Design a protein around this ligand. Sequence first.
Ligand SMILES: [Mg+2]
Ligand SMILES: [Mg+2]
Ligand SMILES: [Mg+2]
Ligand SMILES: [Mg+2]
Lengths: 132, 86, 133, 101, 118, 195, 113
Amino acid sequence: KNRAARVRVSKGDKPVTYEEAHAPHYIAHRKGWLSLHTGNLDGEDHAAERTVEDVFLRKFMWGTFPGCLADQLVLKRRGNQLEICAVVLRQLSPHKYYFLVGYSETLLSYFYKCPVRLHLQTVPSKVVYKYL
Amino acid sequence: SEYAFRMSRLSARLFGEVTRPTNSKSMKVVKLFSELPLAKKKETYDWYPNHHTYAELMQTLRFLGLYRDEHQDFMDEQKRLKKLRG
Amino acid sequence: VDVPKDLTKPVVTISDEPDILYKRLSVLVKGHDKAVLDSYEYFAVLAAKELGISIKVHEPPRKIERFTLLQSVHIYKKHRVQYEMRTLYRCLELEHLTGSTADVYLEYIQRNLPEGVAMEVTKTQLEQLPEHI
Amino acid sequence: HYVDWRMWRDVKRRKMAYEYADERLRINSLRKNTILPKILQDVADEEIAALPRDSCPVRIRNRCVMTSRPRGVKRRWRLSRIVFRHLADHGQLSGIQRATW
Amino acid sequence: EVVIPKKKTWDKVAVLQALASTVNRDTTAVPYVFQDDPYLMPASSLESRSFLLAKKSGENVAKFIINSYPKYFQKDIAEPHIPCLMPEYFEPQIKDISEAALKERIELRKVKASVDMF
Amino acid sequence: RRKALPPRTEKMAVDQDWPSVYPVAAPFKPSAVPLPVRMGYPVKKGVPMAKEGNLELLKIPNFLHLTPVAIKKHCEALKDFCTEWPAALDSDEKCEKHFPIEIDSTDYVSSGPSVRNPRARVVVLRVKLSSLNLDDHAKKKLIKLVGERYCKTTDVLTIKTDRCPLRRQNYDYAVYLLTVLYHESWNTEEWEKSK
Amino acid sequence: SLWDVEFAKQLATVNEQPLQNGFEELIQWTKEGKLWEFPINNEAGFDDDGSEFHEHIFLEKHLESFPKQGPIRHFMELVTCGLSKNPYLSVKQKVEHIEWFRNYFNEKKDILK
RNA sequence: CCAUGAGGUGGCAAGAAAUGGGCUACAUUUUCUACCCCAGAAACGAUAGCCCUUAUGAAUAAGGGUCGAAGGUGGAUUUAGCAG
Ligand SMILES: [Mg+2]
Ligand SMILES: [Mg+2]
Ligand SMILES: [Mg+2]
Ligand SMILES: [Mg+2]
């Protein structure tokens, strides 16, 4: 019995989505990697820096867009430019959405001295994979 | 042979290395000042970005009141509870 | 209906210095997804065909590195957890390729990267003999 | 705001070792060389001995960044095995598969 | 004897100018500055104005935070140093009439100039 | 309160400028994409998840941009800019005859903000001595000096250069090294004449 | 010149308008220089102050104040060898190394053994 | 919460003893020599100790000389194993 990146089976009255529904030994078989970079490949370096920085990205963005997200993010790093993809709920106003988007994007660009972009997909209610 | 010895001398004079013979404790200096020390290599100097910077940034940003820190809300709520209960 | 009249074309100058002659542009793409690698390779070969240059491709073997971790935290030497990093190689060689063609094609592809891929250029260019020899 | 005072000490040691890395290499070469005067070698030895503490790169330790665990830390990723397993299970990092071969 | 094509020189932006002129404007699509999803899709002039103004206000907020706490972003992690990304410094130096006068035209205000004339 | 407009599927016509609606790399944006393709582990008596909440299509790399039509268009556009290779050079023997001194550098490119990487300094070069030396004494001298930088099977002398961090510094050092090496192989010494 | 710059920035503000294309965004990023300059030579900048391979490797001109046989000569020749082998420490760092060594054995010149 | 927190010097980390897991060998299928398999000799065994050298360190490991013994297949208390 191993407990790792898996949700306990409940009565069947709580939504669960694809990524946490599937096991961590199903990552490459039936999932995709959340972060996209080449530091893990051979010949590259700074993999520790990549991991720490992208973990900080995820933390800061999850906590600066609280209550609207319902799933993990998608990071896409093609050379210099960084891209983020999020799925959120239509809870708060588009005013707040755009304001926080611009604010956080400017902060990340200024901090990492790097071109950053981010996109968001609104959903009325978080898509459930199954009821476990 | 002296011929091969002088061949090596010329090759060293051409490619940079010392022509005169040298011991291993003398090539020590060569390879030391060739390869940088671990203390100077950034692998040791910068083992990770500064928790100082990160935590100070997030603390000031909470003081601004934008990042709803769940862990900090937990901590200070239980702090309030303990200071209420004595 | 909206079709522009005068298409703005960038300025170009043919400097007096002659362009460099690359003997071989050998690019090596390292990836994690063989399908993504195949798509990128199709893209590259189609671009090279449309630009009018020779092409060739072959797939070096998959390289894997694994290392064992203790599955639990405190005391469990029997039960470990394993991982593997798989890097997949793909090569593309281009011969009889001019310097400016190299510039334009590499700019195109370098803007057309996907994310999870590493790209290694090896450029082979011939030149004449020096004057001091 | 480091994880703990042992991490604080380790970072101080690393900083000192870096900001006196060159001089240590120079005098260590001047020591370990053999053909030079042995009295000069001894001078360099006593100079190294008089150098301050926390200045050598041997006292530092390749600790983890997240949980401050000294042992079971990979030099490449700099993360403890536990946090590595954490992130691999959460699929946060890229291009790592379970070796079910 | 031998034929060699002549070398050419391009601007870093010229290639992308070509790529852009290659493609026409998107049809039946809002500006690229606006998002793509339908909920965030600005569907009126006044609301779109307010939206990109909120974005500009976030940009100004970013400027304010960076010029209020420069030391946080002081790290030049990126290999190419960029003053556009470096934090901004409108800080008068120590009392120095000559250097203060030279810094007048750098600070772009009037109180410093009044004090310097004084 | 607010309500989102319906997706662009019905709005987009059947004849449509896909290279224009997707000029550069961008997310999948199912609201804009009319294709109903799904991807996901189908549940028992079920099917994969719909394209809307299918974040795994975003996880995987994205190639909706740059369709085959887009690639055709951009290559037709850049055909005017790209130059042509000399027709006289159509074989490797002819190319190495015209320009014997081969030289090659290399470097990776990886995702991240920084771009320097030590391997940027490495370079190597090659030249066959069958046609360059034109003599025997200096040839024997040079082959005695060099230990393994040569290989007579394919008949090319190869030498690397990374002693300098800059590629141009490595290049200039290799050129000057070859020059001085030829100048020093030209002459000889009495201990070399005595063998 | 000053008022010319004022009028130039005014004209630039009048010109600047929001973009509509990712290609235009890329043009802007390359304008401010954050976007990498293809081809990636990994050396766009950092030319080592126009230093040269001979300035890096040949320290014979820096080595003048001691004979060509002594133990200080031996040590400093090995130093120059190692420095020339090291590419990244530039001519500056090499001359600071040699300066510190000069100071060392000249302040310990009381021996000459 | 003048501390049960924090900072800097040192040693601590041995065995009268029993036991566990691994290495060496209790021989001639062994030991040595060149090759790894058509040969020739011996009739073995120190990964411990003493001395010296070397690797990095500011301050254990490998190598060289000496020491050349214990040791004589324990069986059903019980370990691993169904083929590469
Ligand atoms: Mg188990
Ligand atoms: Mg240590
Ligand atoms: Mg205690
Ligand atoms: Mg030691």
